[PDB]
Design a binder for this molecule. Sequence first.
Ligand SMILES: Nc1ncnc2c1ncn2[C@@H]1O[C@H](COP(=O)(O)OP(=O)(O)OP(=O)(O)O)[C@@H](O)[C@H]1O
Ligand SMILES: Nc1ncnc2c1ncn2[C@@H]1O[C@H](COP(=O)(O)OP(=O)(O)OP(=O)(O)O)[C@@H](O)[C@H]1O
Ligand SMILES: Nc1ncnc2c1ncn2[C@@H]1O[C@H](COP(=O)(O)OP(=O)(O)OP(=O)(O)O)[C@@H](O)[C@H]1O
Ligand SMILES: CC(C)CCC[C@@H](C)[C@H]1CC[C@H]2[C@@H]3CC=C4C[C@@H](O)CC[C@]4(C)[C@H]3CC[C@]12C
Ligand SMILES: CC(C)CCC[C@@H](C)[C@H]1CC[C@H]2[C@@H]3CC=C4C[C@@H](O)CC[C@]4(C)[C@H]3CC[C@]12C
Ligand SMILES: CC(C)CCC[C@@H](C)[C@H]1CC[C@H]2[C@@H]3CC=C4C[C@@H](O)CC[C@]4(C)[C@H]3CC[C@]12C
Lengths: 328, 324, 329
Amino acid sequence: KVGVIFRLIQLVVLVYVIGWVFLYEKGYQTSSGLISSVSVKLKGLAVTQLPGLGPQVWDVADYVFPAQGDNSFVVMTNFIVTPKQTQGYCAEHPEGGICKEDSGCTPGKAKRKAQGIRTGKCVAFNDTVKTCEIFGWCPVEVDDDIPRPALLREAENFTLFIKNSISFPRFKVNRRNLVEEVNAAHMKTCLFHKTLHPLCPVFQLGYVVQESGQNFSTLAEKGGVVGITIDWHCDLDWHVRHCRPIYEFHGLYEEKNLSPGFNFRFARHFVENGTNYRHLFKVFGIRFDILVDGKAGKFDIIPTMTTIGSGIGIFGVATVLCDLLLLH
Amino acid sequence: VIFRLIQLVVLVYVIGWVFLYEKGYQTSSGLISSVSVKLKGLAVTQLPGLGPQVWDVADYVFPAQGDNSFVVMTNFIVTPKQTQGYCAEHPEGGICKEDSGCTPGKAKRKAQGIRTGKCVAFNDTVKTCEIFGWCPVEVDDDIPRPALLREAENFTLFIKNSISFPRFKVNRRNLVEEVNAAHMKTCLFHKTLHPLCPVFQLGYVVQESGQNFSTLAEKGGVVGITIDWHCDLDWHVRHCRPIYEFHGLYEEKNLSPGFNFRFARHFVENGTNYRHLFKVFGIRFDILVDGKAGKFDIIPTMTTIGSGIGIFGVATVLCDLLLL
Amino acid sequence: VGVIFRLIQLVVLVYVIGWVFLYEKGYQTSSGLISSVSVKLKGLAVTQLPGLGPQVWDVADYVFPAQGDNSFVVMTNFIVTPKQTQGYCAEHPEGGICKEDSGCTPGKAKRKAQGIRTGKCVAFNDTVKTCEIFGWCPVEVDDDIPRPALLREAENFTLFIKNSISFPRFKVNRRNLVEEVNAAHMKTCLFHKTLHPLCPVFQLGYVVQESGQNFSTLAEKGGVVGITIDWHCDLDWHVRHCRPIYEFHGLYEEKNLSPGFNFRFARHFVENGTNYRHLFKVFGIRFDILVDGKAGKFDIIPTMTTIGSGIGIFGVATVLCDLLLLHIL
Ligand SMILES: Nc1ncnc2c1ncn2[C@@H]1O[C@H](COP(=O)(O)OP(=O)(O)OP(=O)(O)O)[C@@H](O)[C@H]1O
Ligand SMILES: Nc1ncnc2c1ncn2[C@@H]1O[C@H](COP(=O)(O)OP(=O)(O)OP(=O)(O)O)[C@@H](O)[C@H]1O
Ligand SMILES: Nc1ncnc2c1ncn2[C@@H]1O[C@H](COP(=O)(O)OP(=O)(O)OP(=O)(O)O)[C@@H](O)[C@H]1O
Ligand SMILES: CC(C)CCC[C@@H](C)[C@H]1CC[C@H]2[C@@H]3CC=C4C[C@@H](O)CC[C@]4(C)[C@H]3CC[C@]12C
Ligand SMILES: CC(C)CCC[C@@H](C)[C@H]1CC[C@H]2[C@@H]3CC=C4C[C@@H](O)CC[C@]4(C)[C@H]3CC[C@]12C
Ligand SMILES: CC(C)CCC[C@@H](C)[C@H]1CC[C@H]2[C@@H]3CC=C4C[C@@H](O)CC[C@]4(C)[C@H]3CC[C@]12C
């Protein structure tokens, strides 16, 4: 009965190997990619009482800078506005050259960062320091006084709405972020929590940043970067109703570096009294990147046949190894 | 000798199957691509304000540079001449009833103003609250059934895709199918008749998506174009022509249909800051590409020849075991 | 004999496992990466223009997606057609030719439309004429592309790239600014493929457009440049030895039916009581910044399964050698 016992042991080993191969979903299921489309819709307000008077309100279309969605969008969090900018010869900015007596600066564009077409003169900047005279946007920026109170910190309570639609080809199955569990009644009193309500897509910017690993009120002065990822891991063997996304906010938390924080200049032009003016904002804001990836598969007979053939081959190899070790 | 001949035949058949089915004698590469989109059309809106505007190439393609994913106007409800002031809040904020209903502070979820607290009348019979902000004129829910900025189904998209193929250092472009010189003045895109001209039509990009354009422009929608470059790159230099498959990317109807956003353009009239606010129900086009390619390399050929010889040995072992 | 054959088989197996360990990196768990970029351009250009009014294009005046978005256009040429307004005016000599008053009909001219045609014939220029259209009145004339390239001083703009990537499976975060690069280097650093390969890629037109392309003709009519950032590093060593490599692509140079890349964009304003717009046909450079990478760590499951595969391949090699010896016996 030694031979029968050995044959039974080999058969059991082969069965276990086949079960392991069919486990982990390594085989018997196809692999397909996905195509995605993401839209965002922020909703909030912000008071902007400024010592320069003229209170202003930043609406939904005033801080979302792409203003129409896109994967990578920026939400304004702070700014240094220099209104009523016009073209004309006047004093330059410091850290770009110091004028001693009509000799420090020579006519021509300066190397690397430039502020205007230098003409050559010692025009008294109203900071006890005399600099060069340039031809450009006359009221130059003053970015030293970054606003500590975080003028638009009230963005902590904004509600981001990530509407995601995907399609798996080769199965022609299309799904959306709004899973049939979430209905209209769950969109008026809905927030997002990773354990309590993991399906409703109405996130809160404060909460998103908090789960990003970045403390708020310190990246508001100089906007950081936040990355949201919507993993779509689904199996088409079961009903399509079991296709749900997983949100993971891998926030690249640094809070201290050589050049920390996002920052960009943007200007809006207009015409007043027949002269072209310009409003320039140095906006610091938090940029959200919404990366979408996934993999789904279903029953196909070719991968099943290939896996069964590989299982037969590895079972034969195992029997060869067992015979070899028994020979020794 | 019969068994040896059968084993040799099985081995050579396996080798041929490995070489010709999965194409194991060639390597693989990724894809780096750039997409440039240039719409060209016109649409006129006879708004009831006696202000007939003309919307041209720079007025409805919202990302003017034409990114990979962009948006085309198909409907709007303009709310012009907006300044900063106090007036009645939109009724979704609440209902006034008594003067004590309104409270100071912003709203909870969707704030429209500071809500200082008063009971001004928004309509002739409905009073909500008093808010300070972009107050004078507020956006409403009056989506135009005739679908203003219609006839967007006659525009001509133009995808000037480019391909890199870094490892093989072979550069290909969508525009040049090695024959395109006068097929650009008068061409369309048909999946069977003219599958090479990249001057699409928004009628022939939504229709093959499986969604009718009659209800797509009312509340917006999403359309996806793939342009996947599946080129053999081995027995040719040309024959890298891409294939297009406009994916449906979800059907219409259902909860929260379509896709609409809001944007605004500021201006100065009499020393007071103003704002033109548009709510846009525009289609969204996404262009995401992929490719594999492949070229003759000796290392993968040797690796798969070794794998084939191993498979042949395993098959011979299995046959010998079965015979015994 | 038998001992020699066993030693040869053991040596072959050892070589096989060494090859599969030091070539395919079997004891590693390859994973993707997530990424974000923040592109900041610095520079200044001045245009005279035949309008007798000098213009200065500032930091936020040429780069249009003025927040990054890893796909942006740095304007290098334009054809300004200012002071446009709604009215009935003549059409461009590309949608039709006005032989007489009956040569044009109301409609949108099918493919390419510049205005709602009315039918009347109005003289334009001197001989060509045209059909009247209701729309933006002064039609654009893009026939005369400026050869001196106007905003041609783009061979000195700096392109500070602030790339931050994260590998989630190992939960590691890295940035473009390698710890070696500090504030003392950012004051004056220029990216070079051999001498300074770590500080972010600067100076469009000198070490960015030198990808088998020439700024001379890549700014007169626009063009496309692709910067790919590869993060190929392993967390087996210290995290310090994880630095990216930049490669600039040469997608095409010239000799094409539709070369370059240009787009029309309009800036609106209101004067007196009428809405006007400035229309720019911007010819620019599209910089596609694409970042990819891969990383792995030593884990027990991959090394166990690769040692099992090595044992299997050693056994199959042994039985193949035995069969060969039997056939050659
Ligand atoms: N940030 C958000 N917070 C709360 N609800 C949101 C948010 N973004 C989107 N929604 C909801 O998404 C749905 C989409 O509908 P729709 O686009 O008509 O909304 P809306 O622009 O806010 O319109 P309305 O002016 O009619 O309230 C709405 O029911 C809206 O309440
Ligand atoms: N729908 C379309 N979108 C883009 N280009 C189109 C379209 N239909 C035709 N074309 C043709 O594409 C060609 C390449 O476009 P290109 O940007 O180089 O020219 P353009 O700015 O349109 O020139 P012009 O206005 O002087 O005809 C043009 O000659 C144009 O006639
Ligand atoms: N495109 C560029 N070319 C050259 N130097 C640049 C460029 N972008 C940024 N820098 C320099 O690198 C640093 C970036 O720091 P950071 O992002 O905090 O900017 P910043 O201090 O807000 O900039 P700025 O002073 O110009 O307003 C600064 O010292 C700046 O001079
Ligand atoms: C086909 C003979 C040789 C049996 C050996 C293969 C066995 C292990 C395979 C073949 C078909 C397989 C099944 C095919 C389909 C399904 C339905 C799915 O919802 C759960 C898994 C399940 C139930 C699979 C389990 C594993 C399975 C039973
Ligand atoms: C050692 C023996 C088995 C010969 C190995 C090579 C044999 C199997 C032959 C069979 C099919 C052949 C390929 C068939 C077609 C082409 C396309 C041609 O443009 C280049 C050569 C190439 C790519 C051949 C390479 C060699 C090839 C793989
Ligand atoms: C025949 C077998 C058992 C011999 C040993 C094989 C395994 C255990 C060996 C072979 C190669 C080895 C690796 C080679 C190099 C390094 C880098 C070093 O910084 C940490 C250890 C690490 C990651 C080793 C871990 C152990 C390792 C994976």
